[PDB]
Subunit: 396 residues, 4 copies
């Protein structure tokens, strides 16, 4: 973007703004444009636009001045060629798949996918005859194999993963896949463009659920996909039909929230790590999952491709369903609810929060234990948090 702005934080702030917006104003912030359509001063011009000689969004579902800003902004951050913004994370992945994976084509994902993302791939995609292979995040062999066995159209996975924050050696995978013509999409939601640059590591496309960190205020939903033009455009097209456009007001809220992106991540990155270690050492804490810790399976990878380890920490408690429950129930600061990444701290028992619809057996089918607890550290003062968490594990 600019030769003077070299720090991500600085960018996040003035990215796609300080230099120009395309919507001239002597205002500091971006103006929220609430329009359903864009006009023309005369048929002559309209033709020009239609003939690719002028620029216009034409219809709101195709673009918005107040949105593009955030689009370029994120683009700059991830250092991408272009970025797209849907109405929600799920939308993005959804569209992305439907757009890139041809009919009858094959795809490769990890085992630690996010609940819903899984269902889509396992129930909808097959309708299009799109088959998939589910390998473990680490198991690079399986990938290399599958790469040769079938004709992979695209490899897709989130790194860190959910909720065990498992990580994929992006650079490596990227290499393998590209050797077989496969495409690589990394859901760096948990990571954040600040703690890693999937695109830089070789990944083809990187998408985020701005609902979490980017907006980081727990008050807006939004999808987001960034990558090479020739690629992202193909999706935007399909997007222009599925109509999952993002409202301006939402867009703005994200821009504003990203004004203090670095600040928020920084703090969370710490609190988490420190709180992580503290928990691991705790007797009542059976296990702790966090890329920052040395105990983490791919810690060496995290250390190699990341600069931070997110603000989400998962850990099993030394008890059972009701016991673990007792724990979270004791907490006083975090809110018991889904989502994560906002200033407000949140906690939840995945087993119940997003898997209660299954049997104890079918649950364990995917590491989901009744002890497993997911802590999304907010931005509250560390000491305040720790004391709460501690005062909690005590009640058990």
């Amino acid at each position: 973007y600019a030769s003077f702005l070299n720090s991500d934080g600085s960018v996040a702030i003035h990215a796609g703004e300080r230099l120009g917006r395309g919507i001239v104003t002597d205002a500091i912030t971006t103006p929220v444009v609430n329009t359903s359509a864009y006009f023309f001063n005369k048929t002559s011009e309209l033709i020009d636009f239609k003939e690719k000689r002028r620029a216009s969004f034409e219809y709101g579902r195709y673009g918005n001045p107040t949105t593009v800003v955030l689009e370029e902004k994120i683009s700059a951050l991830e250092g991408a060629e272009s970025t797209l913004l849907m109405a929600s994370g799920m939308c993005a992945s959804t569209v992305m798949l439907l757009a890139l994976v041809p009919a009858g084509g094959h795809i490769v994902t990890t085992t630690d996918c996010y609940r819903k993302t899984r269902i889509f791939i396992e129930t909808i995609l097959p309708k299009m005859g799109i088959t998939a292979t589910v390998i473990d995040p680490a198991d690079v062999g399986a990938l290399e194999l599958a790469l040769n066995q079938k004709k992979v159209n695209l490899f897709f996975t989130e790194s860190p993963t959910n909720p065990f924050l498992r990580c994929v050696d992006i650079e490596l995978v990227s290499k393998l896949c590209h050797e077989k013509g496969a495409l690589v999409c990394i859901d760096g939601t948990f990571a954040t463009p600040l703690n890693q640059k999937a695109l830089a590591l070789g990944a083809d496309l990187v998408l985020h659920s701005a609902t979490k960190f980017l907006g980081g205020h727990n008050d807006v939903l939004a999808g987001c996909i960034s990558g090479p033009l020739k690629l992202v455009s193909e999706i935007r097209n399909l997007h222009h039909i599925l109509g999952g456009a993002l409202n301006p007001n939402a867009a703005y809220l994200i821009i504003r929230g990203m004004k203090t992106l670095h600040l928020r991540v920084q703090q969370q990155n710490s609190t988490a790590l420190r709180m992580a270690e503290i928990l691991e050492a705790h007797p009542k804490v059976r296990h702790v999952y966090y890329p920052g810790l040395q105990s983490h399976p791919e810690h060496h990878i995290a250390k190699k491709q990341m600069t931070g380890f997110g603000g989400a920490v998962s850990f099993e408690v030394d008890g059972d369903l009701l016991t673990t429950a007792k724990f979270v129930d004791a907490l006083k600061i975090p809110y018991i609810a889904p989502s994560f990444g906002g200033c407000e701290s949140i906690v939840d028992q995945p087993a119940i929060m997003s898997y209660w619809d299954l049997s104890q057996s079918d649950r364990a089918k995917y590491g989901i234990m009744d002890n497993l607890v997911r802590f999304s550290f907010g931005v509250e003062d560390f000491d305040d948090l720790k004391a709460d968490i501690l005062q909690a594990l005590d009640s058990i």
Copy 2:
């Protein structure tokens, strides 16, 4: 909704509000809830909810207090059992199709479909092996035939149509289809729940593009589908995955717009009609399309199932491309752009506006003439508009 509320207008205003909201407040208007998630006081309750003993949206992609209002409201109007709200019309149709039509199933639609709506059905759906039969709005025979030839899963069309405002004898069609187990979905966008009750006429599902009349202010996009629970819910489920969630702020904006729905429709219904006739009589006006006119092919139907005829009026001008253009360029009140149904008056030359990507020949393939002009009458004073339009033709 209420016994003491019988006129549509009165409903549109107080529908799903005057009696209660679910979010207790001594405030007149509906409060805009900007949350990305909902919390619980204790694990105990969370369980209850999960076990269907308590009520909660849980996540923002699944529901919102500031949205449900609008949901119930529209439900009340269309006199439906339950309504759903997407991020945009296109979203609705899209989902609904992908949700109801099984893989390899067959569907029946009309020829006067809206551009994009067409494409989806002709390019995406086929990927799921879903075939379709395109018949003329009037051609009831073709329908009855197709009904017996293949196994129709659902009949879908808009009434009035776009842009020739063709109308489908809903009551009749409904009967035929239901005889063969097919489902009927009517896109009464142009109609508006005020000018017609497709659901009452027997239709299974009626959907609208709130972007137009419902919001009627040209500052927000929104999809909307109403109908029976057992049905709409099946969609809501898939919607919870494709994530085309509507933002609370947008929702409210519609709630506000519908506060004066009738008032707005009423005036538009007039101006349109009156202006229509004046146009038909004009020498320079080759042809005029409008259900209100006696010249309209299905006027007898329009007169039978409708109470008004929208504010949109299409008409071919006695000239050619450049000539017709010269006309619109002369106008001083309406804006030249897509969309319609807002207080502001809008005009466009479909040929260019949304078909310029095709050849003169391929264009005519669907009645789209270079003369054809689509006038979306705003809410400005009649005389002002008339004088404008006339003074415009004055130069051709």
Copy 3:
């Protein structure tokens, strides 16, 4: 504004928008600019601006692109030179007085002032040694007298009045006052720029409480003063200090509200009148206050300077406190609350609603009776409203 627009409604819609905004955009609606300040490209320019060679709001408290629109719009409606926008009606009157009336100066107002507006003049202004003379709206003699007795700086009154909707022969008063150098300010809140043009009738300044009709959606507060430049500017200056700036978001909501000003008024102007007559005739209705009725004291004046009679209707019920209460309690559509002018209907018993802090005696001191009812007809269907009202006018 333009030549093609001749009806107020048409204006209210495209006033200060259709032709240009000063904030170039190809969007239909006005963009909400959320900025606290405005920048410059270089010191050179800043100087220019400071030297009145360039244009800029500099600080938000001095202006806003999204506000000025609404400013020019109202200007056009009232046919004024320039208009100002405060945070609330009260602010307007407040500022206006503090701005024009010199220290120790004298002022003349009517007896039927709005509660608070009264207190200010009776408790604050005296601090600046500003004395006042309270005359009866009709009593033109008293005015002519005072005009000669003391040295009147400005005559200020609302027409119609609150809550007895009394009316002042603007043209006449204007003439008298100006003969003595006094200024005239009319609070045409109840009237609305559509039902009368105080400025055209000679008034110096006309102010409204956009909180009511202009916004007409019961979801925003706003002051508003229109008049000649040389005058209004003197107020804007003081305004730039008292800092009662109006928020952009608020401004927009008004502009949006005014997009259907005529439509709403028109309907209310009817419902009220019709309902009024019906009420007068009713046996349980002791008295009815409404300029539209022939029974109204200044009906001949109303008929001469207005074109409509608002939507507010006051009337005493044939009972007492508890009885009148029983009436309003029976109503099902209107909301028991202050304010008025919104699509939603509202009712209140001034005696309690805004005078319960006084004694039964001190209350009657100003016509406020325990029977007095103030009905602010919404936009709901007439029949629906009437049925309701009657259904109550019988449970007594």
Copy 4:
């Protein structure tokens, strides 16, 4: 507030939210309530409210559920009894003075007042016979003298000051004034409730211009006053008339901004300091004003009552008007404009920016020099900023 909230930051986040809102919702964020009035279910209740037996804002100008939150929030932060929120800082001071200072009363303020704030006191107040004494921030003697000479009704000043960030030994002054019955009001705008607690140091009332740090995003104006009930309430009353109500939407933006208050301040507190030092050591920098520097006149006081020194840094350059201008013009990151405290960095030449209306001589009358530059460090990366400022300074 609560127990589990000991750190300011933690408070700023969950202050007046985590435990309850008064507007029940299972939502994380506070819901924006856009209403102009509040209703009642029956006359009976209304009476209750009017008789102080129930609670209700009645009218929007008197309160809003979405506002009170921010109110209590700030209250908690400053550790006050109650807080009030105006439409803009200026409004606050304005109302505050007009509300507390009786007619003919006397007041004492410092010489480094903010431009506008000065004028009001020097032009309006005198209309109410309110005389004032202007002493230097440090000159306690003058204060102690005035205290005995006349009958001071209230001592008012800002600390730090603008733009020389001078500081007042709050504790001391408070002690003296309270001995003579005077009231103390501190404008801790520059400080921020995080860098100092005027109320704790003894001050009677502390006010802020949320337009700056509190909102910290340069997209909203808002005044704010906190202090003891018996006091603040007296202001809220007059405020209920001058009608300088703050809009809900605006209120929310602040609430959202304060979600990361500490984070923001922290960073700015550093950058400023560090940058300060660097500047002072610079050869081209003639002088530097910052409470954090040892060179600062009241550094020992700042060090004793503050924990931080804001992000605002003033410094004179070794050149002249045109030279200093050349400097700021060279800057690439900060915007040249008024205001300060938002994530975006801002610079300005007080001489021109807010004193160009005066003569070179009348300007110097108050330390305002053509070299004087006020830098409000944003949140961008330090190195990024430094490099800029540096590269800037060289141009000379």
